[PDB]
Design a protein around this ligand. Structure first.
Ligand SMILES: NC1=N[C@@]2([C@@H]3C[C@H]3NC(=O)c3ccc(F)cn3)COC[C@H]2CS1
Ligand SMILES: NC1=N[C@@]2([C@H]3C[C@@H]3NC(=O)c3ccc(F)cn3)COC[C@H]2CS1
Length: 391
C-alpha cells in the first residue's frame, strides 16, 4: 500500500483528554490558529477576544477580507457555553489541500468552560452537517464550503494517535498526534481492510450498532437500546459514552471479566485514577469490547474490537511518580452512544460523505500489547438491522 497524501500525514497534535487539533489560518494577512477537529458539531468557531486560556485569537479588524454577517450566535450546551458574532473570511489549512475557501466563522466573544487550559487550541472546526449548525441550518459548515468552492473530494479521514502514556503541554506541542486527510484516504495509516457502515442520516455522523460483546460474551440487550436515542462518531468527545441502561450492563460485564482485582466505585464512574507500579499494568485482566455495526450489504454486519489500551486513558499522577496511571474512559449518556476519541484512537476512520458511509480499519498507530490487537472483522449475517435504529 502506498501513502498518497504525504502533505497531510502527521498534521494533528493533541490527546484524548483535551482534543486533537489542526493548524489553520484565517484572514488576510493569514492569522494562524490551532483548531479542534470536531466531528460532533457543525460550526467553525474561533476565539476572537482575550481569554485567560488563549495565547492568541482572531483579530477581525486586522483582516482585509473579513465580512460581517451582522448576526449573533449563542450556543449553550450541557458542559459549557459559547457566544459570538458571525462573519466570513478566507481560510486555509497549511498542512492540508493547497486551497483557500471563504467560510463562515463564529468569532467567539464570551465563553464558559469551553476553552481548556493547556489544550493549545483556540477554536473548533465542526465537521458535521448543516442540520445541527447554530443558530440554524442556513449557516453553511466549513466542509460544505470547501467542497462547493474547490475540487477537493467530499470525504475526509481521521487517524487519532494516542501515546499510551501521559504527555504534558510541552510534549503535546512537540509531538505528532495523528492525521486529518482532507479529500482522501491514505493507505499507510491503517492495516487490514476498511469496512463501511451507512450514515443513517446526515446531521451528526449517525450510525447503527447491532450487537455488543465483552470478551466475546453478548451483552444481550434489545439492539434499539444501543442506539437510544442515537449513536454517533464524535472526535470532540473524549470517552466512549453509552446510554444509561447499556452503560450499567456493560460496566457489570467489565467488572465481572476483571474481577480478579477490585477497583473503587470512583474508578468505574470515570472520576478517579488507578495506578500500577511502572510497567505492571495488568492489561490481560481487562476484556476486549466489540461493537457490531450495520454493513453496506443487505443482512450483513461487521465488528470493531477495542482493547483496554483504548478505554483506559493514561493520566499523570504527579510528575515525580513512576507509576502507570489511568482513568476509565467509558461513561454514561442521556443523549445516545458516542464513539469518542478513545474509541477513534483504535481505528482509521473514513468519513465518506460522498457515499453516505463511514469506514473503519485498524489504525497503524493504535496502542496494543504482545498478545492482542484492535480488530475490524467481518462479515456476519445479521437480520432486521434497520429495526435497531431509534425513531
Ligand atoms: N497479528 C499478530 N498478533 C499477535 C499479537 C498481538 C500482536 N503483537 C505483536 O506481534 C507484537 C510484537 C512485538 C511487540 F513489541 C508488541 N507486539 C497475536 O497472535 C500472534 C501475534 C503475532 S501476529
Ligand atoms: N462534540 C462536541 N463538541 C463541542 C466541543 C467543545 C467540545 N469538545 C472538547 O472540548 C474536547 C475535549 C477532549 C477531546 F478529546 C475532544 N474534544 C462543541 O459543541 C459543544 C461541545 C459538546 S461535544
Amino acid at each position: 500500500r502506498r501513502g498518497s497524501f504525504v502533505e497531510m500525514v502527521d498534521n494533528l497534535r493533541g490527546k484524548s483528554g483535551q482534543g486533537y487539533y489542526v493548524e489553520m489560518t484565517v484572514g488576510s494577512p493569514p492569522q494562524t490558529l490551532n483548531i479542534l477537529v470536531d466531528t460532533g458539531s457543525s460550526n467553525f468557531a474561533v476565539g476572537a477576544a482575550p481569554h485567560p486560556f488563549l495565547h492568541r485569537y482572531y483579530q477581525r479588524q486586522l483582516s482585509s477580507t473579513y465580512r460581517d454577517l451582522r448576526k449573533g450566535v449563542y450556543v449553550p450546551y450541557t458542559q459549557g457555553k459559547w457566544e459570538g458574532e458571525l462573519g466570513t473570511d478566507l481560510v486555509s489549512i497549511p498542512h492540508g489541500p493547497n486551497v483557500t475557501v471563504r467560510a463562515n466563522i463564529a468569532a467567539i466573544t464570551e465563553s464558559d468552560k469551553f476553552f481548556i487550559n493547556g489544550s493549545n487550541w483556540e477554536g473548533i472546526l465542526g465537521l458535521a452537517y448543516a442540520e445541527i449548525a447554530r443558530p440554524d441550518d442556513s449557516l453553511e459548515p466549513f466542509f460544505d464550503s470547501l467542497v462547493k468552492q474547490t475540487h477537493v473530494p467530499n470525504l475526509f479521514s481521521l487517524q487519532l494517535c494516542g501515546a499510551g502514556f501521559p504527555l504534558n503541554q510541552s510534549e503535546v506541542l512537540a509531538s505528532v498526534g495523528g492525521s486529518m486527510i482532507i479529500g482522501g484516504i491514505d493507505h499507510s495509516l491503517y492495516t487490514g481492510s476498511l469496512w463501511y457502515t451507512p450514515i443513517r442520516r446526515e446531521w451528526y455522523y449517525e450510525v447503527i450498532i447491532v450487537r455488543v460483546e465483552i470478551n466475546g460474551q453478548d451483552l444481550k440487550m434489545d439492539c434499539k437500546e444501543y442506539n437510544y436515542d442515537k449513536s454517533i462518531v464524535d472526535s470532540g468527545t473524549t470517552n466512549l459514552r453509552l446510554p444509561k441502561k447499556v452503560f450499567e450492563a456493560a460496566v457489570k460485564s467489565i467488572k465481572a471479566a476483571s474481577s480478579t482485582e477490585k477497583f473503587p466505585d470512583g474508578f468505574w464512574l470515570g472520576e478517579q485514577l488507578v495506578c500500577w507500579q511502572a510497567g505492571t499494568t495488568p492489561w490481560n485482566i481487562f476484556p476486549v469490547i466489540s461493537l457490531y455495526l450495520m454493513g453496506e450489504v443487505t443482512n450483513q454486519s461487521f465488528r470493531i474490537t477495542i482493547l483496554p489500551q483504548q478505554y483506559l486513558r493514561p493520566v499523570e499522577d504527579v510528575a515525580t511518580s513512576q507509576d502507570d496511571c489511568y482513568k476509565f474512559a467509558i461513561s454514561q449518556s442521556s443523549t445516545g452512544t458516542v464513539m469518542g476519541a478513545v474509541i477513534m484512537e483504535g481505528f482509521y476512520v473514513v468519513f465518506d460523505r460522498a457515499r453516505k458511509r463511514i469506514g473503519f480499519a485498524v489504525s497503524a498507530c493504535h496502542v496494543h500489547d504482545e498478545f492482542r490487537t484492535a480488530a475490524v472483522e467481518g462479515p456476519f449475517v445479521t437480520l432486521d438491522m434497520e429495526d435497531c435504529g431509534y425513531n
